[PDB]
Design goal:
- Three copies of one chain form a homotrimer.
- Chain A is mostly helical and 225 residues long.
- Chain A has helices at 4-24, 31-55, 75-95, 99-121, 125-154, 159-176, 178-185, 195-219, and strands spanning 60-64, 69-73.
- The first copy, chain A, contains eight helices and two strands; from the N terminus they run H-H-E-E-H-H-H-H-H-H.
- The longest helix of chain A has 30 residues, at 125-154.
- Chain A has a single domain (1-225), classed as Rhodopsin 7-helix transmembrane proteins (Rhopdopsin 7-helix transmembrane proteins), CATH 1.20.1070.
- In chain A, a hairpin with a 4-residue loop joins strand 1 and strand 2 (69-73).
- At the A-B interface, helix 4 and helix 5 of A face helix 2 of B.
- The structure holds ligand LI1 (8 copies) and retinal (3 copies).
- One retinal is lined by residues 47, 80, 83-84, 87, 112-113, 116, 119, 132, 135-136, 139, 176, 179-180, 183, 206, 209-210 of chain A.
- One copy of the ligand CC(C)CCCCCCC[C@@H](C)CCC[C@@H](C)CCO[C@H](CO)COCC[C@@H](C)CCC[C@H](C)CCC[C@@H](C)CCCC(C)C binds next to helix 5 of chain C.
- Chains A, B, C: This is Bacteriorhodopsin.
- Chains A, B, C: One of its GO terms (biological process) is proton transmembrane transport.
Chain lengths: 225, 225, 225
């Protein structure tokens, strides 16, 4: 299958991302730095396994909608289900967010992937978009809290915290919101962009939001207590 | 389908419930009130999505048992899986429960929905009831802790706490135990009550245990620190 | 089916395990002893439900690999998914492990069962072993942290803690690593050992790692604060 190379290239990059983070994580014995290193290595590990599941073709399935037999990488939702809230925890711990606010976001994130998955496998075409919309909605809630609520409390901590957060926020804020767009125009939605392009688009995005995101966070001197 | 209206009416009520709670939650910046507001809005959000999934027919499936092809809304279990422990957490935080007790209840709740679901999709008629029984059993465990162990510690806190808890306990204690009953006589079990009635019965129950429940809790002056 | 008796025997042992733990747990009102009792009872309850689901034949499924139709107790992965991380929590709470480290382990455990399941239901034979290997790899990570990281901080606490831990570690360290071996040689992998034997092998293992493990822990005077 044409996108095979993109799934390979992502399996690889996620692999190396995990291993790098795993080694870079050796000899870190601060409770706070641990937490971070822990979460930030899980994302690409989980990501790695799902990229491989897609590469080997275990993450793939045939959903009928549109009078056609459309291909749907369901693995992506299995992956995101776990990676995406972890990624949020990273941000939340950093700014020192309320037990409350975290539960809020994870809840929202859950629903977001939750509905997105439902969407992806729905057999009535127009219906899929109702799911998209609901998910897209949950996203706007995350992006809100991240942008408004978080930047407030982010700005009332150490110089290194606020800075690192701000970059990490920005990256997420931008790249995260690219996913629904891709979804919509892609084979899950309109079928405007072809699968091989969609996969590549997603593949670049994932690598960035995870390894890229991770590289920034774990490199910073801001993960410490 | 006859119950379509009940699923609509519940989608709606859960929708509004979520939105009411979402707005009512704006401008609440106490760490404790947040926690509550967060949990109590997830419930109806999750509930909203699952009611919609049933309405659109994504939460529905055909399970054969009894030499028939019986309609099972599986989405209910996907819903309850998450909503029900959250609801417990609400009660648990209110009384200031031990880290232990909470894990106890969530585990029990898990098993209750867990087996419930297993029961619901079991193809051997008599077998379903074994599952019912096991689930019904875990329920009696929660209702216990709630009634005995919780009311103890509930009673050794502020006046507003004990009061609010007591109502909330009562509401849960009564309406929660109605679910198995309905399950049993309904199309999951005996098939005495018809699906459309079952759905309405369930719909009324859900709206109460969630929005109803929530309305009470979020209105009280007892969610604060 | 030949192994029916083994699943029965396990259902039974897990049942009694649960009930014993449930009774023995009455009248324990220390926050730390609660936590432990809570987790250690969940394992066998969860275990009980999945051994029944396997006995009743709800946990079973036909996976095609090797040009044959192989039988795969998928329930095992449903069980382990939850039992195995709880088992680790028990160990981690005991030694007083970092929020970080726990999250680390649970993560690894998730991936372990995560991939194991993927493996079990994979339709390409050689493929199954790639999953095994990845899973087996996560295991080595858990066994490491348990053996190296944990024994360090374990040895810097009370005499009773270090001792009990050391036993519990050892039991886990040995018995846990038997599972992959069994998997490989069994009907999931090579199909060297027969299912009825595999089941018996697993059956003994589960009972030991759960009830046995639990009997040791809950009997000890080290679960207290
Ligand atoms: C948390 C917090 C948030 C939870 C949000 C609720 C939504 C849960 C989504 C889940 C739904 C599960 C889908 C799946 C099991 C249904 C399987 O049926 C398949 C449909 O394609 C069969 O086709 C092949
Ligand atoms: C707050 C609100 C409630 C928000 C909820 C959003 C609900 C919207 C539901 C969409 C619904 C009106 C149906 C859209 C399909 C539309 C193309 C026409 C219906 O069927 C077509 C035949 O006419 C199928 O064409 C197949 C041929 C293809 C070439 C497809 C047409 C090309 C279009 C560019 C893609 C259109 C489909 C979706 C992107 C529509 C909604 C997108 C929007 C939410 C960004
Ligand atoms: C409020 C927002 O600042 C205060 O946070 C306090 C925390 C809570 C208000 C957080 C609530 C949890 C989520 C916002 C619930 C997620 C559901 C929605 C994002 C989905 C929107 C669609 C709706 C029609 C169901
Ligand atoms: C939190 C606690 C500690 C955990 C407690 C542990 C309890 C056990 C949980 C797992 C248990 C629910 C098993 C899941 C069953 C699932 C594989 C259904 C498929 O098996 C069916 C019978 O062989 C086939 O129906 C297939 C076709 C159709 C007849 C029906 C399809 C079923 C639905 C699409 C599945 C819905 C599942 C999600 C809600 C989850
Ligand atoms: C501590 C214990 C281990 C736990 C106990 C769990 C085991 C219970 C399993 C019962 C099992 C032997 C099956 C019972 C069915 C029995 C009435 C036979 C009639 O079955 C009918 C035809 O064969 C099925 O159609 C159905 C047609 C119906 C419309 C007929 C009406 C009569 C009844 C209402 C049939 C339904 C049976 C259930 C109500 C079972 C009782 C539940 C009870 C535990 C509250
Ligand atoms: C709480 C009550 C209930 C939910 C507990 C489980 C119900 C029980 C019937 C177990 C079902 O599993 C098999 C029946 O097909 C029996 O084991 C397999 C062996 C069978 C071949 C023999 C069956 C004989 C009995 C059904 C033995 C089970 C006795 C329990 C009902 C006693 C539990 C009472 C107490 C612990 C709450
Ligand atoms: C360690 C983390 C916290 C959690 C671990 C994550 C590992 C990934 C789990 C693998 C699992 C999704 C694969 C099992 C396949 C199984 C669900 C069958 C696929 O069918 C469904 C298609 O509708 C997918 O639903 C869907
Ligand atoms: C890095 C990872 C570990 C990668 C592992 C990749 C696995 C290599 C391919 C496995 C295997 C097919 C090759 C060896 C057997 C060969 C003669 C082919 C025969 O396969 C048979 C087809 O009829 C399978 O049925 C008869 C069944 C037997 C042939 C069983 C053979 C399979 C082996 C048991 C797999 C090796 C186990 C190791 C991973 C243990 C360490
Ligand atoms: C590592 C993967 C990450 C960080 C993925 C993030 C994914 C999203 C934010 C996906 C969002 C979606 C919507 C908002 C609309 C519906 C389609 C989805 C699931 C692609
Ligand atoms: C918002 C939904 C709530 C609070 C649902 C609560 C549901 C239950 C307590 C269901 C219980 C069941 C049993 C105890 C017996 C078996 C059947 C079930 C799953 C309906
Ligand atoms: C109560 C059950 C317990 C403690 C189970 C532990 C199970 C494992 C450690 C299973 C491990 C596996 C691998 C490491 C390789 C692939 C096959 C598995 C899933 C059997």
């Amino acid at each position: 299958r044409p996108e095979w190379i993109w799934l390979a290239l992502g399996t690889a990059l996620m692999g190396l991302g995990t291993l790098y983070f795993l080694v870079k994580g050796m000899g870190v014995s601060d409770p706070d730095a641990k937490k971070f290193y822990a979460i930030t290595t899980l994302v690409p590990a989980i990501a790695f396994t799902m990229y491989l599941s897609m590469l080997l073709g275990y993450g793939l399935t045939m959903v009928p909608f549109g009078g056609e037999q459309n291909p749907i990488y369901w693995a992506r939702y299995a992956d995101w289900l776990f990676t995406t809230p972890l990624l949020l925890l990273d941000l939340a711990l950093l700014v020192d967010a309320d037990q409350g606010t975290i539960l809020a976001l994870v809840g929202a994130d859950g629903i977001m992937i939750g509905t997105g998955l439902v969407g992806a496998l729905t057999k009535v075409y127009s219906y899929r978009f109702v799911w998209w919309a609901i998910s897209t909605a949950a996203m706007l809630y995350i992006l809100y809290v991240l942008f408004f609520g978080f930047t407030s409390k982010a700005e009332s901590m150490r110089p290194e915290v606020a800075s690192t957060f701000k970059v990490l926020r920005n990256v997420t804020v931008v790249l995260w919101s690219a996913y629904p767009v891709v979804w919509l125009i892609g084979s899950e939605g309109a079928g405007i962009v072809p699968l091989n392009i969609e996969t590549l688009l997603f593949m670049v995005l994932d690598v960035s939001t995870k390894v890229g995101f991770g590289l920034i966070l774990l490199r910073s001197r801001a993960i410490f207590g």
